[PDB]
Each structure stands twice: as structure tokens, then as C-alpha cells.
Design a protein around this ligand. Structure first.
Ligand SMILES: O=C(N[C@H](C(=O)N1C[C@@H]2[C@@H](CO)[C@@H]2C1)c1cccc(C(F)(F)F)c1)c1ccccc1-c1ccc(C(F)(F)F)cc1
Lengths: 119, 120
């Protein structure tokens, strides 16, 4: 119940535990989604901690995250005990789904996406 | 442009200086209000489609602080016009939020999930 400020974030982004999130409903392939997040000084969702990102338990549907074949856009590799990766469509990219799941998806398939910023 | 949000408690979502927390354990309206108050909060109050446009993203229906004068919030203020489309669902004196900016009239005794809100 102790209070603190969250961010910094742009005003139209969700802030949770100092990370900033934005949902995009216009569907794009994985590469175009990454390009969109970069154009907003951001990256596709990176999952690094269940505790600091427990809001992701509430994120429904299926959204591009920055995981590719596994490693993140920034070149860091997927840490253990974070995501359950399930095959869906033959491919080298992954969609985030609740709760802490990644569905493998062809990187060229259009999908909604989540971008994430941290300052 | 970057700015700081809140303040909020750590396990709450912050958006445009308001704090939100979803509760998946189903409670009737009265128990839901009591739950938010124990966290120094209230049930969701809807006052602005701009300041609270994240509510367009909320899936399912959840207790908010609107009760039946007219419909009023827990804080005694009136529901502002042209904010919510009110729809009759059950015989009742409480309302559930649903996207986008709908309010379902609901029996206050029906268990539902709920949204607490805080603003320091
Ligand atoms: O609504 C729910 N999940 C959304 C989702 O999965 N979306 C996917 C994508 C749509 C657009 O197609 C977007 C977002 C969601 C998730 C996180 C944050 C938000 C936001 F609201 F903060 F932005 C919205 C949801 C689903 C099941 C149970 C509870 C919720 C829920 C989430 C947050 C809140 C609240 F914030 F009020 F505490 C209340 C209920």
C-alpha cells in the first residue's frame, strides 16, 4: 500500500512497475510491429520477470512480442522459468498469450502487438 | 514526451495519474466496495473518456462504483452526461462497467469481478 511514482512514460501508455506498455490493434507482421515500436522510441514487449510484469497475466488475445528464434530483439536471451512456448504455426517468431505463454507464429503473419518502453 | 505517473501503490496500473487494480475473485457490489476501501481506494469511478481512455481496452464486465434521484458515484457526485451508455441487464441498483463505456444495470447481490481505483 506504500505509494510511489511510476515511469517515466508517455501519457497515453500504461505504466506498471516503471515499465510502459501500449497495445496496437492495427495488425502487422513481426518486423513491421518492431519497426512501429522503434518509431515510438520503444521495442516489442520483452518478458524478463514474472513478478515485475505480473500484469501480463491479465493480457488476453495474442500479441507480437520481441522473441525470435530463443532471444529478444536486443540480443539478450530468454531467461529460464518465464514462458511456456507452444507451437501453433510454423515460424521463427512468438505471440504473447495469457498466462506467460508464447505461441510460435510465422513472422510474416499479421497480428496485434504490444510495445514496451523503459527510461 | 515522458512524464511520471501517480503516485500509485506498486501492484497497481497507473494511467494519467489514476491507479487501477483488477480483482478476479467474484464478490457482490457491497463486498467489492468493502474490498477497495480496505486498500484505501474505491470502486472504479468514470469521469472522462479522455483521461480514462484505457477503459476502452478493459475486457469483460466488472463492478464500478455507480449506484441508484439518479445514478451516483460512491463519492456522492452525479454521473456526468454523455460518458456511459446505460443498459438494463438485471433488476438492480448497482452497475457493472463494460467496454466501450457501457454501464450494465445489475443486481447488487450478484457476484462479479471488480475494479478498484485510487488517486492521491
Ligand atoms: O481488460 C483486460 N485485459 C486487457 C487486455 O488483455 N488487452 C489486450 C489488448 C486489447 C485491445 O484489443 C488491449 C488490452 C488489459 C490488460 C492489461 C491492462 C489493461 C488496461 F486496461 F490497463 F489497459 C487491459 C482484462 C482481461 C481479463 C481480466 C481483467 C482485465 C482487466 C485488465 C485491467 C483492468 C484495469 F486496468 F482496469 F485494472 C481491469 C480488468
Amino acid at each position: 500500500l506504500t505509494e510511489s511514482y511510476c515511469g517515466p512514460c508517455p501519457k497515453n501508455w500504461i505504466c506498471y512497475k516503471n515499465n510502459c506498455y501500449q497495445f496496437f490493434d492495427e495488425e502487422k507482421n513481426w518486423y513491421e510491429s518492431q519497426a512501429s515500436c522503434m518509431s515510438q522510441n520503444a521495442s516489442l514487449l520483452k518478458v524478463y520477470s514474472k513478478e515485475d510484469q505480473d500484469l501480463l497475466k491479465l493480457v488476453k488475445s495474442y500479441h507480437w512480442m520481441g522473441l525470435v528464434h530463443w532471444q529478444w530483439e536486443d540480443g539478450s536471451s530468454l531467461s529460464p522459468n518465464l514462458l511456456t512456448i507452444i507451437e501453433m504455426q510454423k515460424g521463427d517468431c512468438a505471440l504473447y498469450a495469457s498466462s506467460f505463454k508464447g505461441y510460435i507464429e510465422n513472422c510474416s503473419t499479421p497480428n496485434t502487438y504490444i510495445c514496451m518502453q523503459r527510461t
